Design an enzyme around this catalytic site. Structure first.
Site, PDB file in Angstrom:
ATOM      1  N   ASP A 110     -46.032 -19.192  -9.765  1.00 13.61           N
ATOM      2  CA  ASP A 110     -46.761 -19.312 -11.020  1.00 13.61           C
ATOM      3  C   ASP A 110     -45.763 -19.717 -12.104  1.00 13.61           C
ATOM      4  O   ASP A 110     -44.630 -19.221 -12.133  1.00 13.61           O
ATOM      5  CB  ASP A 110     -47.453 -17.985 -11.373  1.00 13.61           C
ATOM      6  N   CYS A 118     -55.770 -22.507  -9.521  1.00  9.19           N
ATOM      7  CA  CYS A 118     -54.823 -21.408  -9.382  1.00  9.19           C
ATOM      8  C   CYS A 118     -55.411 -20.104  -9.909  1.00  9.19           C
ATOM      9  O   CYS A 118     -56.472 -19.665  -9.467  1.00  9.19           O
ATOM     10  CB  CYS A 118     -53.517 -21.730 -10.111  1.00  9.19           C
ATOM     11  N   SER A 119     -54.712 -19.487 -10.858  1.00  9.04           N
ATOM     12  CA  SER A 119     -55.142 -18.212 -11.419  1.00  9.04           C
ATOM     13  C   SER A 119     -55.896 -18.410 -12.729  1.00  9.04           C
ATOM     14  O   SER A 119     -57.017 -17.928 -12.890  1.00  9.04           O
ATOM     15  CB  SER A 119     -53.939 -17.292 -11.639  1.00  9.04           C
ATOM     16  N   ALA A 120     -55.274 -19.123 -13.663  1.00  8.54           N
ATOM     17  CA  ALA A 120     -55.933 -19.491 -14.914  1.00  8.54           C
ATOM     18  C   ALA A 120     -56.649 -20.838 -14.775  1.00  8.54           C
ATOM     19  O   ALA A 120     -57.497 -21.189 -15.587  1.00  8.54           O
ATOM     20  CB  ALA A 120     -54.902 -19.570 -16.035  1.00  8.54           C
ATOM     21  N   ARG A 141     -50.744 -24.849 -12.502  1.00  7.98           N
ATOM     22  CA  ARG A 141     -50.635 -25.496 -11.203  1.00  7.98           C
ATOM     23  C   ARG A 141     -51.818 -26.439 -10.937  1.00  7.98           C
ATOM     24  O   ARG A 141     -51.626 -27.540 -10.432  1.00  7.98           O
ATOM     25  CB  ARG A 141     -50.526 -24.423 -10.109  1.00  7.98           C
ATOM     26  N   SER A 142     -53.034 -26.013 -11.285  1.00  7.71           N
ATOM     27  CA  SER A 142     -54.226 -26.847 -11.087  1.00  7.71           C
ATOM     28  C   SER A 142     -54.118 -28.178 -11.843  1.00  7.71           C
ATOM     29  O   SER A 142     -54.520 -29.226 -11.331  1.00  7.71           O
ATOM     30  CB  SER A 142     -55.476 -26.109 -11.562  1.00  7.71           C
ATOM     31  N   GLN A 178     -48.273 -26.538 -17.918  1.00  6.10           N
ATOM     32  CA  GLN A 178     -48.060 -25.290 -18.640  1.00  6.10           C
ATOM     33  C   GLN A 178     -46.595 -25.123 -19.031  1.00  6.10           C
ATOM     34  O   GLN A 178     -46.273 -24.398 -19.972  1.00  6.10           O
ATOM     35  CB  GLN A 178     -48.519 -24.098 -17.799  1.00  6.10           C
TER      36      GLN A 178
END
Ligand SMILES: O=C(O)COc1c(C(=O)O)sc(-c2ccc(O)cc2)c1Br
Length: 297
Positions: free
Chosen positions: A180, A214-216, A220-221, A261
């Site tokens: 991350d 990904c998570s948020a 990564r997305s 990010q």
């Protein structure tokens, strides 16, 4: 040329500045629906929400909200749905979206647990004999098989709309070694993974947009979608020089905030696109090299 610009930014050591300029120029649209009190528990991160104009609406009367954005790249002609990694209470919504949008593939770029924290619910079955039933959206999910590799896994699931009893094959592409706020171990690892997704047919226009998370759903997305769109653009024109990476990223940020990010992920995007261009421009042998280099076995 993106390659000349890359080495110009690299020599002048200014990726931070370039990245911040993108952050300063990025689009800013209202996320009114995402901020409604009733949707507080449908968001994993308070500061990460879908714009109202590009948000994915669930096809239900009760509450049609879900933290997911439709990134519609007009010129490139490919779409992606960038979403939250799902919460314990939104797994049903997640698969409802996958069904309604007609997606064939789901690309998971994170691990369920990262840095001691649960970055995503267990929203797919880990064992064939243990199928999942999401009672709120009336859907059943079954793991059909899985091909485990060194740093990514590919799962075949069966999604069934219990209401109509119709079923669909959903391919799950799980990248397990992408830290991350970090980057892949090499452009080869990444491109190899990206190409496994492409070869599956999941990105084809005959299917609904591929779901990426990904998570948020933005670090990564975003890095994954930027590399793909950039390769597809120069691929359509067979002209690497006609692709402006920063411009493409800004464009993507019109559909969802915060795409990519850190400055290093941005730098990696360049690196991956530059490496991937070799294949696009007709050197097919690099593909086998990325596989060697990735050590998926
Ligand atoms: O996918 C990535 O590169 C990082 O994804 C992540 C997070 C994580 O996975 O822990 S947290 C996060 C975030 C960044 C700024 C905020 O105000 C709120 C949340 C992002 Br963005």
């Amino acid at each position: 040329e993106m390659e000349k610009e890359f080495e110009q930014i690299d020599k002048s050591g200014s990726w931070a500045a370039i990245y911040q300029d993108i952050r300063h120029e990025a689009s800013d649209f209202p996320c009114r629906v995402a901020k409604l009190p009733k949707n507080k528990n449908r968001n994993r991160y308070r500061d990460v929400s879908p714009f109202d104009h590009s948000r994915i609406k669930l096809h239900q009367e009760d509450n049609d909200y879900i933290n997911a954005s439709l990134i519609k790249m007009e010129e490139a002609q490919r779409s992606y749905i960038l979403t939250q990694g799902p919460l314990p209470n939104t797994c049903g919504h997640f698969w409802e979206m996958v069904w309604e949008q007609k997606s064939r593939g789901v690309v998971m770029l994170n691990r369920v647990m990262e840095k001691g924290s649960l970055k995503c619910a267990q929203y797919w079955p880990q064992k064939e004999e243990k199928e999942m039933i999401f009672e709120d959206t009336n859907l059943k999910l079954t793991l059909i098989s899985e091909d485990i590799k060194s740093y990514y896994t590919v799962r075949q699931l069966e999604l069934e709309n219990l209401t109509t009893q119709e079923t669909r094959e959903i391919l799950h592409f799980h990248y397990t070694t992408w830290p991350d706020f970090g980057v892949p171990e090499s452009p080869a690892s990444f491109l190899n993974f990206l190409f496994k997704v492409r070869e599956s047919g999941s990105l084809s226009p005959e299917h609904g947009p591929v779901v990426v998370h990904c998570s948020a759903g933005i670090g990564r997305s975003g890095t994954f979608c930027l590399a793909d769109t950039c390769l597809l653009l120069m691929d359509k024109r067979k002209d690497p020089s006609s692709v402006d990476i920063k411009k493409v990223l800004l464009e993507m940020r019109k559909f969802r905030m915060g795409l990519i990010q850190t400055a290093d992920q941005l730098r990696f995007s360049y690196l991956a696109v530059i490496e991937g261009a070799k294949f696009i421009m007709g050197d097919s042998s690099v593909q086998d090299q990325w596989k060697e280099l990735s050590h998926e076995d």
